[model samples]
Target chain A: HMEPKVGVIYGLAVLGAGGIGDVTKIIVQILESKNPGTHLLNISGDIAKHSITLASALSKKLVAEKKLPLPKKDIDLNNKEIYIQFSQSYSKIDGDSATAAVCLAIISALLDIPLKQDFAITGSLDLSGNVLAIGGVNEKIEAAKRYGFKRVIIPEANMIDVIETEGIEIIPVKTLDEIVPLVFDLD
Target chain B: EPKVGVIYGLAVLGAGGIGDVTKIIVQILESKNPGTHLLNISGDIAKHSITLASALSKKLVAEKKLPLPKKDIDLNNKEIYIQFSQSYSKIDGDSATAAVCLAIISALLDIPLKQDFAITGSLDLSGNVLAIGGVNEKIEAAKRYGFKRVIIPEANMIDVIETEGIEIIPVKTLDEIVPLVFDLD
Candidate 1:
């Protein structure tokens, strides 16, 4: 833990088994590696599908076209060591639905941009930067509202099943790029 | 789950010369700001054992040029806690020095040490792996625990006998041991 870069950022609101959802904070730290070309991604948490989800996320243009601090002809993830962990390490999470949220956290950390705390995001991501639909749309939105979030960002495909609720803004996005401005602060 | 900061150390139990193995866990917790007393250790271990491990670790980091925090080891100061788990017997001696050193390095570098192998050796301040007693018994204990390989000091190679199912590796220095234990890409 001696100066191994710790970037604490919050965003994803996951739906629980009780049909209620809550906010989960993600911390992404960039570390200097002795083995640089390894492009190692060390994630600490009780999670499943670490390989398949992260592979598709980094293989996509989502990171290559946006968010690295410098301009490069090609973005190689092997340049530095990446460490990811949830604030509550014990919380068990599974599936690929949190791909977009995790990618946004990675981008926010890589760019050193502050994600607006007032908003929460959840959705599956494709290699084409498209936001795919996930389950528990109504429960996730209601949970975000209960947690005092002013806005909730979800996949556009899930909008059909969502019922309008007062005192909260539900923004449906079809692509991951569309929600960058909605969740991240340029300032 | 297997993770960084945990290493298996070999020890000798009883004055009758029986051998044993134990798990050594190093938990590194970082504070947002700088602080002192960075190293903390706890276990049912002999007093000199603690000093042996901690002293060698400090000496190794100082001499070996470990990639520690740049700013006086503060600013991002870590509280390094060492614990000995599954210690059914009262553990004693400096034999676990190499294991302790590797555990600290693993936690600091974010690299994981191979769980399939166990290690035993006394480390001098200059990072030389010194011989320890009871190599034969330790190797047998490691085999009984289902370990694939056991690392011992090169000086102790002559002491090892009757290694049946487990592989025995003899290392001369700390530098020579890193590549063997770490699970690198």
Candidate 2:
């Protein structure tokens, strides 16, 4: 199953002595929004296998097609460099699992909508935009709570195991369809 | 303790009223510098096979299965050099998807593959490990080669008639076989 992480944002997984499922931060920026771009996903630590990086590129390309006033394909980025860096470090997270989130990250950026930074989201993705199940939901929620996030977004399948925590809101989502409404406060 | 970019991809042999399963060594490689999305490929490779492998690499890289930095894992800047070396035989078959995925990851991340095993299955763009044919013959050939284990898609469980010596492992998705093949060391 795939999950979500939209915009220059990361709805990630963190593994430790306690466990994984922690949401964290990462930043992405292109030299010119109109000039096309590259995504560099590892900066400080070595992030092995962030297909979510390339997926982020493809996702941005696809998401921008529907959301951008003009399609990116029209620009012919044949010459533009494409690179990605992991602004935040987590153990090597699953890119397929974060497909929805990464795809959404591209859309979130293109739409010019600000995400509720106070919130964290995670999920897997597919061509059809379905949000699939993933592990570490409890750890993810607690990870968000420990960081003082107002809310945490996880997969619907994982909702059964959650133990509500005061002040931190938990919202379980199933597809990218649901994530769009939750992450982006579209005007 | 493991060798990277190596896999036992199942292949089909169509000849003289006899269809048999053959094992082929699939090798994967990724490099920085300039390259085409065609990536790098060798052997008696069919254009469609190369195309499919290229697509599969994109999917694997997108899913982050390799051990390299995802940026260096940059699909565009990278070249996935592949070869279906059996130390001797074979040709084109879509069933090599899982092998290609594994080979490419091994090469991309420089992770070593467990030489004692063989894997066969087709992979879709979404990482769904689908069924492939010639399982009986494939397993037979694997056992003949002294492999300790052989992996096939879960969907083909019924087609298999248990064989001794080599352990039989069934998989549903690509993720299931990652740790199974690579030592993660």
> What's the TM-score of chain B for every model shown?
0.75, 0.73
The candidates' interface RMSDs, in order, read: 29.8, 16.6
**Model 1 agreement with the true structure over B52-101: per-residue lDDT tens digits:** 44555455456664444333322136565667754432222446767877
**After aligning candidate 1 to the native by TM-score, how far in Å is the CA of B94 from where it should be?**
0.4
Per-residue accuracy of model 2 over B1-185 as CA lDDT, tens digit each: 47766666655454211123333433333455644332223332333344445565566556776444443444445554555543212222445657766666566556678878877765655566654445666777777777788898764454465679889998877677877888876
- What is candidate 2's TM-score against the reference? 0.44
Clashes in predicted model 1: 0
How far off is residue B21 in model 1, in Å? 1.9
- Candidate 2: chain B TM-score equals 0.73
| Pairs in clash, predicted candidate 1 | none
TM-score of each: 0.41, 0.44
Q: How displaced is residue B7 in candidate 2, in Å? A: 24
